[PDB]
Amino acid sequence: MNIFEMLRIDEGLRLKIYKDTEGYYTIGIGHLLTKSPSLNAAKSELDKAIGRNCNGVITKDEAEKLFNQDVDAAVRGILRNAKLKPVYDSLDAVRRCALINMVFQMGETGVAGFTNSLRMLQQKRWDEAAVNLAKSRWYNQTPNRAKRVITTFRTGNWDAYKNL
Numbered sequence: 098m099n100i101f102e103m104l105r106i107d108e109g110l111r112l113k114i115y116k117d118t119e120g121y122y123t124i125g126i127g128h129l130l131t132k133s134p135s136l137n138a139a140k141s142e143l144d145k146a147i148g149r150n151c152n153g154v155i156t157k158d159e160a161e162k163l164f165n166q167d168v169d170a171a172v173r174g175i176l177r178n179a180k181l182k183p184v185y186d187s188l189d190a191v192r193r194c195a196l197i198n199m200v201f202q203m204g205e206t207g208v209a210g211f212t213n214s215l216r217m218l219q220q221k222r223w224d225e226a227a228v229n230l231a232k233s234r235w236y237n238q239t240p241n242r243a244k245r246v247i248t249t250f251r252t253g254n255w256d257a258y259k260n261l
Contacts, residue, residue, distance in 0.1 A: 098255045100168060100194045104201060106261045107242050110160060114139055114153045118239055125160035127201065128167060171200045180209040187219050195249040202242075203235065218250060227251045 108127030114136065117123050122130045122139035130142040136153075143151050147159055155163075175181045175196065185196060196218075199208045209215075211233070217226035227247050230236065236243040248257040 098258055100197055101164070103194055103198060103255075103258060104164070104168070106258055107198065107202075107245065110157075112155055112157070112160060114143065124155060124163075126164040126167075128160075128163045167201065168197070171197050174205040175200055178205050178209060180212075180215065181205065184215050184219050187221075189253060191253050191255065192218070192250055195246050198246050198249075223251050223253070 105126055110126055111124060114122055114124050114130065117129065121132050122136065122142075124130060124143060128146075130139045130146070133139070140151075140153055143153065143155070146163065147155060151159075175185050181196070181200070185193060188196065196208070211230065214226050214229045217229060227250060230247050230250070231243070233243075236247070245257040245261070249255070
C-alpha cells in the first residue's frame, strides 16, 4: 500500500463536479475547487485547473493528473512548514503517510493547529496521541476516515486499509 492507494480509498473518484462532506464543490480524487456556493464559480475554477472547457466533467486521466499535483503539494507543504517538518522527519514511512493524508484533507494550516497531538507523535507516544487526535471536529465530522488515519498512527502498519 502507498500514499496514492491510501488516499484513493479515503477520497474516492468522481468525474463530475460534486459536493464535499462539507458542501464544497470538488472533483476527481478529493480536489477541492472552490468554497463558494456557485456552481458557476466552480466550473470556472475547473476549466482554469485543467486548461480546457470542461463543462463540469473531466476524464480519469485529468483526475489522476490533479491527484499527482495535490499529493506533491501536500508533501512540499509539510517540508516547508516549521511546525510539520520536524514531526514528518521523526516518523517512520507508514506514519508519514498518515500525516500526509491529514494535510491533503485539511491543509497545512489546519494540521499545524493540532499542537498537542503533533508533540505526542514526535515523542512516539502512539496511544496517547490517538486519544488526543479523536478529540476534534475532524473526528466527529468524518469518523470512519479519521479512525483509519488514527489507527495508522497508532500501529504503524496498514491494517485499517486491508479491510477496505
